[PDB]
Amino acid sequence: VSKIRVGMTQQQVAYALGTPLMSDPFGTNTWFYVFRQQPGHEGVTQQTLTLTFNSSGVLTNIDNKP
Amino acid sequence: VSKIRVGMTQQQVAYALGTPLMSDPFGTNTWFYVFRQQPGHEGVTQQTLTLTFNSSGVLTNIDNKPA
Amino acid sequence: VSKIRVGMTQQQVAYALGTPLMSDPFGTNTWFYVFRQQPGHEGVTQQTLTLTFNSSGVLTNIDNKPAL
Amino acid sequence: VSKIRVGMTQQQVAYALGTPLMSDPFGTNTWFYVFRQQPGHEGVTQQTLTLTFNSSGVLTNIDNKPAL
Amino acid sequence: VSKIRVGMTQQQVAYALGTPLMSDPFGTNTWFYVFRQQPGHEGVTQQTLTLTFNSSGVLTNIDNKPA
Amino acid sequence: VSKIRVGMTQQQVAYALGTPLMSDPFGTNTWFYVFRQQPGHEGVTQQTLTLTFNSSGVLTNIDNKP
Numbered sequence: 001v002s003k004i005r006v007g008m009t010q011q012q013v014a015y016a017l018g019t020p021l022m023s024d025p026f027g028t029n030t031w032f033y034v035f036r037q038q039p040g041h042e043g044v045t046q047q048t049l050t051l052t053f054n055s056s057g058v059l060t061n062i063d064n065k066p
Numbered sequence: 067v068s069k070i071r072v073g074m075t076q077q078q079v080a081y082a083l084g085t086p087l088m089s090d091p092f093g094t095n096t097w098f099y100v101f102r103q104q105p106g107h108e109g110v111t112q113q114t115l116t117l118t119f120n121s122s123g124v125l126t127n128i129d130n131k132p133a
Numbered sequence: 134v135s136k137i138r139v140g141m142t143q144q145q146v147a148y149a150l151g152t153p154l155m156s157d158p159f160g161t162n163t164w165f166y167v168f169r170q171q172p173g174h175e176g177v178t179q180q181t182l183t184l185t186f187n188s189s190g191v192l193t194n195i196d197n198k199p200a201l
Numbered sequence: 202v203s204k205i206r207v208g209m210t211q212q213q214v215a216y217a218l219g220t221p222l223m224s225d226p227f228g229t230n231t232w233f234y235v236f237r238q239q240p241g242h243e244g245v246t247q248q249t250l251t252l253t254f255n256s257s258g259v260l261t262n263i264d265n266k267p268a269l
Numbered sequence: 270v271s272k273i274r275v276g277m278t279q280q281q282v283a284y285a286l287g288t289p290l291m292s293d294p295f296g297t298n299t300w301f302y303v304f305r306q307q308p309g310h311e312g313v314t315q316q317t318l319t320l321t322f323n324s325s326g327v328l329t330n331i332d333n334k335p336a
Numbered sequence: 337v338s339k340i341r342v343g344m345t346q347q348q349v350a351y352a353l354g355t356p357l358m359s360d361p362f363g364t365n366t367w368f369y370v371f372r373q374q375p376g377h378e379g380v381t382q383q384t385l386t387l388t389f390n391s392s393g394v395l396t397n398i399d400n401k402p
Contacts, residue, residue, distance in 0.1 A: 031086035289367035
């Protein structure tokens with residue numbers, strides 16, 4: 001924590017402390033859902049969803065898995 | 067168990083599905099650390115850190131409250 | 134690990150092992166909700182709620198973000 | 202939400218909103234460690250540790266899994 | 270920041286990297302639920318559930334302790 | 337919780353309660369790492385690792401991202 005200073009880039013902070021446990025999802029390019037402890041789950045593997053957004057915050061790819 | 071389509075904004079997707087469990091931290095403005103399971107913890111409350119970055123990804127505020 | 138002993142205070146245990154991944158919320162003074170993967174979310178930041186309780190486990194402060 | 206009020210007990214708040222995603226570990230009676238993404242892990246199940254504290258925040262029970 | 274190679278067993282990978290943050294629950298023997306942020310919670314402790322499944326994926330023990 | 341009974345398959349339980357918050361990683365086919373709050377992080381995106389194991393518990397694929 002003394003390992004960081006105002007003016008550092010996200011790369012410099014992440015090098016010092018690691019990436020954070022949480023961050024705000026708005027403005028970022030990738031959102032990942034894992035649908036746990038939600039009734040109605042189906043299949044032989046954990047349902048997940050990866051969403052890709054462009055720099056304007058618009059959804060460009062929907063990746064279901066499976 | 068709900069409907070999205072390409073071209074939706076993040077507000078539309080969050081209304082439909084909720085915010086995601088995880089998202090990529092690079093490019094956003096607020097990072098939040100909670101230092102768990104790390105030896106050397108001190109104090110009477112859980113140590114945390116909130117960082118604010120500007121539109122360019124540079125750190126402008128370090129909030130260690132506590133405290 | 135072997136670096137903890139019965140009789141230790143929560144500070145000593147937290148200095149040896151760090152705080153735990155999880156703990157029972159009853160009896161503590163601060164609760165933190167993060168409303169994720171819940172349809173109906175609104176706004177331009179992640180909705181959260183920080184509740185402060187006194188010693189008697191009574192709620193004394195409600196802190197919504199964003200502000201209601 | 203609007204379904205909580207200052208003066209509520211932790212039970213009333215938990216009935217209205219559920220327990221929180223996170224809480225401050227200090228002051229509670231049970232801590233639970235899950236040692237993941239930590240090099241050195243051994244054995245055939247996930248290593249965990251459950252610590253029980255009394256009212257004074259003093260450790261009274263250590264429960265390692267698997268058993269040491 | 271540590272070294273794995275194809276052909277390693279899960280014990281070898283866990284020694285090198287630790288266990289993973291997440292894994293697929295299907296096919297294993299122990300499931301653990303912690304019911305957070307769900308309205309209608311009752312009791313003086315966090316409600317949890319530990320389920321044991323046999324090698325075939327069938328439920329053989331329901332542990333609701335608490336209690 | 338009264339929604340489940342001994343003898344149900346993992347598919348029946350997951351349909352009633354959802355998948356669990358946690359499960360034991362040994363014996364399963366996919367392990368996912370997200371290296372957060374670990375100093376030394378590098379890059380312009382969150383480092384992760386997906387490992388695939390066969391039914392004998394042997395590592396068959398290493399997928400770094402990026």
